[PDB]
Design an enzyme around this catalytic site. Structure first.
Site: not given
Length: 161
Positions: A17-18
């Site tokens: 997802e970051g």
């Protein structure tokens, strides 16, 4: 016994997802702001900042519904890792993909580990066509399914060309 996505699974999801430490509007049409690991909704306040560790807490909380959907039907002989990998799929692609009528969903329910993994390898498409990001996340998802640490699952995913 009721199950929870493990720390190894939360951190796998988190890596793909970051993390963004500051509230921001991801696209101009979205009604709400986003923060952390893709956390999106009325709770995100303009100018809020959070740490990666807070992001994991939020992520775990945001994954609640996906975890319940997998926990409600996955065979209890799945390993923690295999459960984690399905939790990431359902979070990413929605709970429809494990509905009782799908092939994924019947292998999940019966504990047919081998078939479950083969079905898991097919979620690389958007609107019927392969996408490189979904091949990466799936490749890493298969590494997580197999028991590897999130760091290795990530690297195996991103090395896909």
């Amino acid at each position: 016994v009721s199950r929870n996505i493990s720390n190894n699974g939360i951190k796998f999801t988190a890596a793909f997802e970051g993390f963004r430490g500051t509230a921001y509007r991801a696209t101009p049409n979205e009604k709400y702001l986003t923060i952390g690991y893709g956390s999106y909704g009325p709770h995100v306040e303009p100018g809020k900042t959070i740490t990666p560790g807070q992001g994991l807490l939020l992520l775990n909380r945001d994954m609640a519904k996906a975890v319940a959907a997998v926990d409600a039907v996955a065979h209890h002989s799945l390993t923690q890792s295999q459960f984690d990998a399905v939790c990431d799929l359902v979070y990413n692609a929605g709970a429809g993909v494990i509905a009782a009528a799908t092939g994924t969903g019947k292998a999940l329910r019966s504990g047919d580990v081998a078939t479950l993994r083969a079905k898991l390898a097919l979620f690389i498409n958007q609107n019927g066509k392969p996408l490189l990001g979904l091949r990466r996340r799936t490749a890493g998802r298969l590494a997580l399914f197999d028991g590897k640490p999130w760091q290795e699952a990530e690297a195996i995913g991103r090395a896909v060309k």
